[PDB]
Amino acid sequence: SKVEDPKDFPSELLSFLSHAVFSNRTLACFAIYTTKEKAALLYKKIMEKYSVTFISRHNSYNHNILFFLTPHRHRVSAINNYAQKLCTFSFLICKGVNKEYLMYSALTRDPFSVIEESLPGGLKEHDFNPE
Amino acid sequence: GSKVEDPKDFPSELLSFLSHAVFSNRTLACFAIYTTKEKAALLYKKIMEKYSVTFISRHNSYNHNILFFLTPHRHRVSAINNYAQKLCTFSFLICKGVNKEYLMYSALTRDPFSVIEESLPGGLKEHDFNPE
């Protein structure tokens, strides 16, 4: 497990991410990195639990990354709590997203791919703009 | 609110192939799990591996799923149940010893049930539950 499990997100994505998982500054864009089986499950649980404004599921080579935005702010430790406790096996990494567009956009391109998203045709740059 | 929504037991069509002593000290090598279609999917694999099942099958039961499996050594029912309760912690899950293995499995193949997938193709027959 020290041998098998990712210690973090793919490095291609760490610069779009917040690494202060134990902060108190709340965020409203989060990312979860985990196995494909757990990510399929969480796709729907996080959706229903957090009344997400948006959620998408992504190929990450062997695994999956979920990308989602909440209608209101939350602490990381909080989304980490809920996510870790739903299924208690395998690895899970859940971090804040600082660069919302940039994050979701890399997930739509090689080596990542979209498995599914709550909103047909997902997002674009303009969506992270004004109103 | 669980009480209103969750199955309190296996469907009644199969209650008599089952042991209803979940606190028993008797050990068994045939169990069944009643749970949501998604928990059951995870469990199909995680039960297989954890318990090195001789056989496992997964079945539609109306809107949920039933897991049927056989183990290479015996196991107290409480044991298998706890491993199942922990994994995923969210919906309903009923775990019971199976007393009448072949009837259980064979019912699980006829409507209102059906086989989603099984570890052995193409499933089990009467002769499989006989002597050698």
Author numbering:
A (entry chain B): 130 to 260
B (entry chain A): 129 to 260
Copy text from the publication.
SV40 T-ag is a 708–amino acid protein containing at least three independent functional domains: an N-terminal J domain (amino acids 1–130), a central origin binding domain (obd) (amino acids 131–260), and a C-terminal helicase domain (amino acids 266–625). In the case of SV40, a single virally encoded initiator, large T-antigen (T-ag), can bind the SV40 origin, assemble as a set of two hexameric rings, and cause local distortions (ie, melting) of the DNA. The T-ag obd recognizes the GAGGC-containing duplex DNA at the origin and also binds double-stranded DNA (dsDNA) and ssDNA in a non–sequence-specific manner. In this paper we describe two crystal structures of the SV40 large T-ag obd: one in complex with duplex DNA and one as a dimer in the absence of DNA.
The second crystal structure we report is that of a T-ag obd dimer in the absence of DNA. This structure has been refined to 2.6-Å resolution. The asymmetric unit contains two T-ag obd molecules linked together by a disulfide bond. Although the presence of the disulfide bond is likely an artifact of crystallization, we include it here because it facilitates our description of structural changes associated with DNA binding. Perhaps coincidentally, the obds in this dimer are oriented in a head-to-head fashion and contact one another using the same loops which mediate the inter-obd contacts in the structures of BPV E1. The monomers are related by a pseudo 2-fold symmetry axis with a rotation of 178° between the molecules. The dimer interface contains a mixture of hydrophobic and hydrophilic interactions and buries a surface area of approximately 740 Å2. The T-ag obd–obd interface is nearly symmetric with almost identical residues (18 total) from each monomer contributing atoms to the interaction surface. These residues are from helix αB (Glu166, Leu170, Lys173, and Lys174), residues at the end of helix αC, and residues from the B3 loop (amino acids 213–218). In addition, the cysteine residue bridging the two obds (Cys216) is completely conserved across the Polyoma virus family, and the C216G mutation in T-ag has been shown to be defective in unwinding closed circular DNA. The two obds from the DNA complex structure have the A1 loop in one orientation (flipped “down”), while the three obds crystallized in the absence of DNA have the A1 loop in another conformation (flipped “up”).
